Design a protein around this ligand. Structure first.
Ligand SMILES: O=C(O)c1ccc(OCc2c(-c3c(Cl)cccc3C(F)(F)F)noc2-c2cc[nH]c2)cc1F
Length: 242
């Protein structure tokens, strides 16, 4: 079923186009739009907890777009609800972190944040400099690959659809979706002469560890200073919030 695989590609890429938040062309064109030193100081002088509220709300929105991404993947809504939640709990923030590389400019080590590009020093008030450095470093590694939009879409589909996540109830059903996505990704890389990126993808455990550290810090902040969430997915919200 060759066209089936070429189908799944178009459908992962449609889901991705509909949920990617900002077009790559817009992110690239704005690269010259950089926060001034005056604007940087304004962010650095904000309360920890206001910077936390702003960042938490951008991240909640990013997670919701990833959930919509998964929901639009052919086969995902046919998984049982338990397995949908297991997969999204384990992988949605991993996908958010990967998606960040599109908004990262390796030339000056800046990220697109609230309308302009700024470096790590923008986030000083959060007092999380080690975690922020790890996020910038990771985006720097991914940015060297020059990910195309379909590569990010297919790669992040596989971040989510991982039959190894503990707690799955219909593991063979997740495996079938995983195998088809893997074939789609590998067929696409062969067609575009891009198989060389396979050896350059983040090693096993590196995205897991960064995401673990990230979510753990978000949980600490939410314990100290809870944000109000525009909750759209009750079964998933209930797994992350208490
Ligand atoms: O709309 C919803 O129903 C809905 C459900 C869950 C959700 O979870 C976000 C989330 C967060 C997070 C964020 Cl983004 C900001 C502040 C605090 C937290 C934390 F840590 F307290 F949970 N961290 O990890 C995840 C996650 C989700 C899937 N895997 C990981 C967000 C939603 F909008």
């Amino acid at each position: 079923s060759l066209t089936e695989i070429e189908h799944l590609v178009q459908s992962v890429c449609k889901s991705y186009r509909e949920t990617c938040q900002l077009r790559l062309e817009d992110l690239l064109r704005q690269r010259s739009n950089i926060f001034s030193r005056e604007e940087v100081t304004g962010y650095q002088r904000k309360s920890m907890w206001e910077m936390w509220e702003r960042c938490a709300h951008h991240l909640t929105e990013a997670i919701q777009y990833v959930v919509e991404f998964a929901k639009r993947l052919s086969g995902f809504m046919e998984l049982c609800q338990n397995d949908q939640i297991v997969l999204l709990k384990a992988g949605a923030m991993e996908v958010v972190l990967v998606r960040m590389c599109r908004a990262y400019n390796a030339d000056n080590r800046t990220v697109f944040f609230e309308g302009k590009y700024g470096g790590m020093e923008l986030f000083r008030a959060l007092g999380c400099s080690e975690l922020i450095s790890s996020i910038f470093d990771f985006s720097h590694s991914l940015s060297a690959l020059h990910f195309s939009e379909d590569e990010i879409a297919l790669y992040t589909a596989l971040v989510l659809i991982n039959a190894h996540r503990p707690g799955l109830q219909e593991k063979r059903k997740v495996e079938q979706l995983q195998y088809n996505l893997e074939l789609a990704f590998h067929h696409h890389l062969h067609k575009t002469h891009r198989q060389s990126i396979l050896a350059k993808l983040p090693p096993k455990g590196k995205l897991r560890s960064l995401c673990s550290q990230h979510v753990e810090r978000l949980q600490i902040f939410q314990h100290l200073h809870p944000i109000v969430v525009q909750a759209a997915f009750p079964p998933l919200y209930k797994e992350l919030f208490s």
